[PDB]
Symmetry: D2
Subunit: 173 residues, 4 copies
């Protein structure tokens, strides 16, 4: 099995739920998933991650709450202490993906993906067209969509997780 790290920062519990969704989706993708959160400057049942352990995974999904469109200082400060890993090129060709929350945050997405790109990580974006197709799909199936994540957002997170998982699996097998 490929190993995936779901690393998140949640200020109000939203991004945590999104992260759990992504992790579940990734487990359904046949990956060994570990859920962790970044240090502070809330579910304590979730272990706190270290910057140096990121090289121990084949894929890394980063999700973070946002403040007025920018990265949360916690996630950015966490990723800033991965200079050694960068110097080694330890994260090169590892699969990565980013989730952001505004509970629009394009700048945050760009910044997080910037830090991930400079590590040489392969980036898996959102499936936008599919995510707008989803409403029509669930309408056809007989169950239309309609601070706390909706069903559509969670489904999107799950799908994202599984997609990243399968892609990683393809890259290792």
């Amino acid at each position: 099995m490929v190993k995936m790290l779901v690393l998140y920062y949640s200020a109000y519990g939203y991004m945590e739920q999104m992260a759990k969704a992504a992790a579940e989706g990734a487990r359904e993708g046949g990956a060994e998933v570990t859920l962790k959160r970044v240090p502070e400057l809330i579910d304590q049942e979730v272990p706190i991650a270290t910057p140096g352990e990121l090289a121990d995974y084949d894929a890394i999904i980063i999700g973070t709450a946002t403040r007025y469109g920018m990265m949360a200082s916690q996630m950015k400060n966490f990723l800033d202490q991965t200079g050694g890993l960068w110097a080694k090129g330890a994260l090169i060709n590892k699969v990565g993906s980013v989730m952001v929350s505004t509970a629009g945050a394009e700048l945050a997405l760009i910044s997080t993906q910037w830090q991930m790109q400079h590590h040489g990580m392969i980036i898996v974006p959102l499936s936008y067209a599919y995510r707008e197709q989803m409403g029509n799909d669930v309408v056809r199936g007989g169950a239309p969509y309609g601070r706390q994540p909706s069903a559509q957002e969670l489904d999107g997170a799950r799908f994202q997780g599984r997609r990243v998982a399968e892609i990683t699996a393809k890259l290792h097998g």
Copy 2:
């Protein structure tokens, strides 16, 4: 073999050379490569691409000249005519990569934005490796010194081959 499109816009021939380098590297990666340029609004021997043919490739490398840090209008206007492909989701899970020439970070971000919204899998530059290269070629006995330098061309080749191999692994 996986099929790759090296699509470029060059205002003065720089990005054309970079594109040829990338295409060569991709050929060395065991990929079937097609080199094409976007329409205007100088090498006429290089075929002009159509927006709708992008779905016919397993991987797409986009290189563009930049103006004061932004995307060239040609490339953006070309990519703006892929609305149908987006609606179909024709480019989802296709491997992509971006080269930019003049710093032009904003252009990189915009091009990668358009490629991301198509759901394309993005392959970035190997930055740490790109600083390692100087020391490498110094150890080898051949240090690096309008027209791309040897280091930049080698970087383009490496990028192309990397994308090629990644695509091959994703399709094999």
Copy 3:
């Protein structure tokens, strides 16, 4: 009186209404306002603008519809033909401001403001804190807020226009 140009691109009539609001607000700011739209690649009573006329105004407000978070090709193509003006430095120290529509578009705002910045134009941003204060204000006054622009958005546009106008007036008097 200071002269202001309200230049806009509207695909579906939203940004046009926002632009009219901004223009009215600017007139209330004591400025001589001219409303224009960029060429195509819809109110034909509104004159089409030329790239070279931008130097004839003390202030320029740019509003544009957005496509998946990016600038509309019309506005960008229009601003791309102002190379001569840039070469002269004709727009240096002229007051500028940007409105964007998604009928979030942070990247579009950044790009438009990028083109305006490289001309050396003085940038007047949105009054964010005031714009969230506005709801509470109109609630206190006895008239709470609640494809087609809402009352709050139009009021924001008007306020923006007047603010830009007064700032420009201060810079010329």
Copy 4:
């Protein structure tokens, strides 16, 4: 006189020199200038600034060193502690400007983002003038040639004075 704060973060002394240049230029613009640096997480003779004092100035110039194209964490962490000032709207209509050192367009965009959301009036670089400068000093008889060059320092000074005069006009 209008009051201006030149707030900077320097990792290796470059942005410190740029900041001194900007402060000098602003003094020549008839402004009362205070030079300060952000806290850490080398010149101890330069006073350390507090997040809440930013409202005491008519104009604020922010200069910061950059790391791989992004904002330095120090400056961003400092500006993140101005939530109260934002809630009050204390920095609305105050004149602002940004200098960045290494291309670092993303850092410029982020810093200007934080300054914009405070409602600060933004004064950019004079780019066309900054390419005019070389030809100017060539005509004058003194062509330009880790430590900022004469052209960069002159640019910093010009920026400072420009911001100063603009602020003075906005308060006069």
